[PDB]
Amino acid sequence: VMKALILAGGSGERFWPLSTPETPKQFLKLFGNKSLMRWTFERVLEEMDPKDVIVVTHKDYVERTKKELPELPDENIIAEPMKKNTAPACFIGTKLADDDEPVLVLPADHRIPDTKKFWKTVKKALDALEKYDGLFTFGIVPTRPETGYGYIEIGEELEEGVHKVAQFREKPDLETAKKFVESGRFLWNSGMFLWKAREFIEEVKVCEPSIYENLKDVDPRNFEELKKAYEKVPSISVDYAVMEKSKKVRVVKADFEWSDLGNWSSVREIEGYTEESDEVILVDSDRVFVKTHNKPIAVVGLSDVIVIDTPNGILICKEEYAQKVREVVKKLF
Amino acid sequence: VMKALILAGGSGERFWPLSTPETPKQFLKLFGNKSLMRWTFERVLEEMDPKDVIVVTHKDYVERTKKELPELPDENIIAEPMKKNTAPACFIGTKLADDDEPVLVLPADHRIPDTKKFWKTVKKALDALEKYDGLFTFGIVPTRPETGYGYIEIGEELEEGVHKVAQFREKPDLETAKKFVESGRFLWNSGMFLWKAREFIEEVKVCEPSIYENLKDVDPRNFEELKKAYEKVPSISVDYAVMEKSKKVRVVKADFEWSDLGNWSSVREIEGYTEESDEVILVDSDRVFVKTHNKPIAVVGLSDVIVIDTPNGILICKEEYAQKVREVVKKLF
């Protein structure tokens, strides 16, 4: 018995001009002519019947989620009355589970190309969960001194590849980041989780009563009932809400390619820089990421720049400012 | 009793994506829905009869020239068999005047907004020509430092605003223009010339026979004959051919504002950097020049760039590399 909980609340904001307010990150077909969420759903379906998968997302997103995931029973989609981040989503998704049922929590907007190593790692976490209880996160083995991700400090070892979490650390300085990688004592917080339903519910009661009392006996499908609760409930990631507080947090080492797809630079990391070609002309310009639409694009005198041309517009972004594409969406709409 | 010779040739390559690849610069409509040549023809018509205006241009553009300039008599367009730069075109155009007629030679792809001051200057230049003879140039006081213009060293003062030319200088290093602009002994060569038909003819015999001996007996309007004579005749500017070598070059301080429209930067210099607007979004980006087309353009984390969007393409160009747009066109086909 196992439940999968897909959290799908993102913003394509950093993916303008490809993303539109009407199309959040989760529906973007960045790879292979399928959305991030679809890939994620298919990843899960490798080892699970869809009866045990749950999507927690806004109502605006619900209908297109049905057309994206025809296999998913309409009941298993769970409409949210407002964006209050992952912690409340996690909570209402977890209540569908039975007390001693494992709940695997997954963002809809990440990329994990090896579906088998993913399940190898999840099986390992399931076995560990049964041996030690507590709340489990997945730490990705860093392959570069990445400043864009948050980190998990390895603690005491229970078993090979399963550790207590000594500490969480947010985006570090490049030197600090380089020390984290060289050390081998830090992992990337993948944003993925695994816990037994009952244990998480109880853990929130101490960490964030705010969340527990208001959602305690609210039926998550009853749209109206959940609105009042949500009006009462704060905005706060479960990372901040529970994980940063509990004394029973473990990490499982994940040996697989993973990305949060944070911004356009993240896509470049996966794809590599763009090749000079008949639609991309480069003169004294290196390390450029260019997605063309229907006309040639020439970049002259500029290095480390992202250029995206879609019908919604054209973006031209120095690479390190790829997080500030959000501001474009703020100013534009 | 005075001829105007308009030289109509020049690559418009540096105005990609506006210009097609072999598009002649003189037909670009950079300002007010009128071509550079049209503006130039109108400027001369302020004081002149079309019968005294000669356009020297490649055969391919004769018909299109007629259409820009319908006031111009069909016989006043002289069809060249090959592109051979300005010295040979100056020659065959200047042959059409009487020996003692003044001939004002003007580039077709410059921008002189103040027509009245243009003619103020010319009339001063005509009066000087009558007193002193020689080949006259028009010097522009450097309002800026900029490399790769022509350069005229101010020599002996013949009379106020009329000097001999100590030296003709066709190129410079960066910030050597600083000790030309702050030295005050150097004017930009505006590319306009004034001479009596016969003196210039004599001077081509002395400065470079190659052109003179091959073209002296030839009638400019007999295409075949001109086609035969041009095979023997070199491609060389009148600057390198005559001005740089001649011992009778005078200079006149120019009383109007002027620009050579060398590249996209020149257009920025005239229009200004671009205003953040409905279709131009600027995050952490200063001193950008942006011509949108059908969609919004966001420029994030980048300064001193030119972004031009047209059906033919998109150009993103660091401002100081604006000459290198030539390299783009080469790569494009």
TrEMBL record, chains A, B:
Provide the residue positions that the database annotates as binding GTP.
7, 9-10, 12-14, 25, 56, 80, 84-85, 108, 326
Every copy of the Nucleotidyl transferase domain together lies at: 3-271
Mention one GO biological process in which this protein takes part, according to its record: GDP-mannose biosynthetic process
Q: Which Gene3D superfamilies match?
A: Spore Coat Polysaccharide Biosynthesis Protein SpsA, Chain A
**If you read the UniProt record, what top EC class would you report for this enzyme, in one word?**
transferase
Residues covered by the MannoseP isomerase/GMP-like beta-helix domain: 278-332
Instruction: Supply the SUPFAM superfamilies for this chain.
Output: Guanosine diphospho-D-mannose pyrophosphorylase/mannose-6-phosphate isomerase linker domain, Nucleotide-diphospho-sugar transferases
Protein name (database record):
mannose-1-phosphate guanylyltransferase
What species was this sequence derived from? Thermotoga maritima (strain ATCC 43589 / DSM 3109 / JCM 10099 / NBRC 100826 / MSB8)
